[PDB]
UniProtKB/Swiss-Prot annotation:
Domain PV NS1-Nuc: 16-248
Primary localisation category: host cell
One GO process term, biological-process aspect: symbiont-mediated perturbation of host cell cycle G1/S transition checkpoint
Whole sequence portion shown: 6 to 253 of 672
Motif RCR-3, residue range(s) on this chain: 205-209
Active site: 205 (for nuclease activity)
PTM text: Phosphorylated.
Short sequence motif named RCR-2, residue ranges: 122-124
The protein's assembly and partners: Homooligomer; when bound to DNA. Interacts with human SYNCRIP. Interacts with host transcription factor SP1; this interaction allows high levels of viral P38 promoter transactivation by NS1.
Name of protein: Initiator protein NS1
Domain notes: In the N-terminus, the endonuclease region is involved in binding to the origin of replication. In the middle, there are the ATPase and helicase activities. The C-terminus probably contains a transactivation domain.
Hydrolase found in the keyword field: yes
Organism of provenance: Murine minute virus (strain MVM prototype) (MVM)
Keywords in alphabetical order: ATP-binding, Covalent protein-DNA linkage, DNA replication, DNA-binding, Endonuclease, G1/S host cell cycle checkpoint dysregulation by virus, Helicase, Host G2/M cell cycle arrest by virus, Host nucleus, Host-virus interaction, Hydrolase, Magnesium, Metal-binding, Modulation of host cell apoptosis by virus, Modulation of host cell cycle by virus, Nuclease, Nucleotide-binding, Transcription, Transcription regulation, Viral DNA replication, Viral genome packaging, Viral release from host cell
GO cellular component: host cell nucleus
Amino acid sequence: YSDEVLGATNWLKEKSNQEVFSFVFKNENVQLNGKDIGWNSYKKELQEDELKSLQRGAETTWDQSEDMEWETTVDEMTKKQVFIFDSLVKKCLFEVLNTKNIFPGDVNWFVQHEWGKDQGWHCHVLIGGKDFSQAQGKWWRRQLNVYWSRWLVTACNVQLTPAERIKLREIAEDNEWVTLLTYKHKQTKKDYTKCVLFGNMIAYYFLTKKKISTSPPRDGGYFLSSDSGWKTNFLKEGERHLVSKLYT
Ligand code: NA
Ligand code: NA
Ligand code: NA
């Protein structure tokens, strides 16, 4: 019952029933003129001050949440790429908030990077607040995907021609490398945005995942998480499970 665990539990419980959007930021493998662009082909560290700051935050989140009782053999390239993506994902969120003149304190968000059995690296984002309504989901997904595709093409470490860069930009947009949770529906039919309950989804699902500590990563594991209150960021796997237990 450290103050950090109690604080995280209380912060989530107060937001147990807050409706929020659920997004996934992802990438997919691309080959352009024989050039292979994989999940970790986005390793430029762009020298924009905000991005640099966000990347430092990811690094320090990793460092503080690391359990040294146990060895961690995650590849250095994998960590670097995840830190970069954390910065890029957040840059996208913050760009859209600016478009809507949303003061950051009026938003609650949670980010968790995971490795899926089939899709590999992806990043879950929950985000919402008083300035949000369900009907805005589609617009949010589209805007986020604009920024995500733009940043990915800027961060790509593969030497690309201009035609290749443009093609990559259009693939990331057309193939929806940012997804939005909707209710299940028929392909033809309307797709309704499905809000999730912030605190509950975090405590009863995201905090239940196993921490990735190897390369290759364990399927279904998490790399790194953070939230707008800096509440869960530094928690080790064991502490995360204590939060779920106390939350219940
Ligand atoms: Na970068
Ligand atoms: Na790896
Ligand atoms: Na994070």
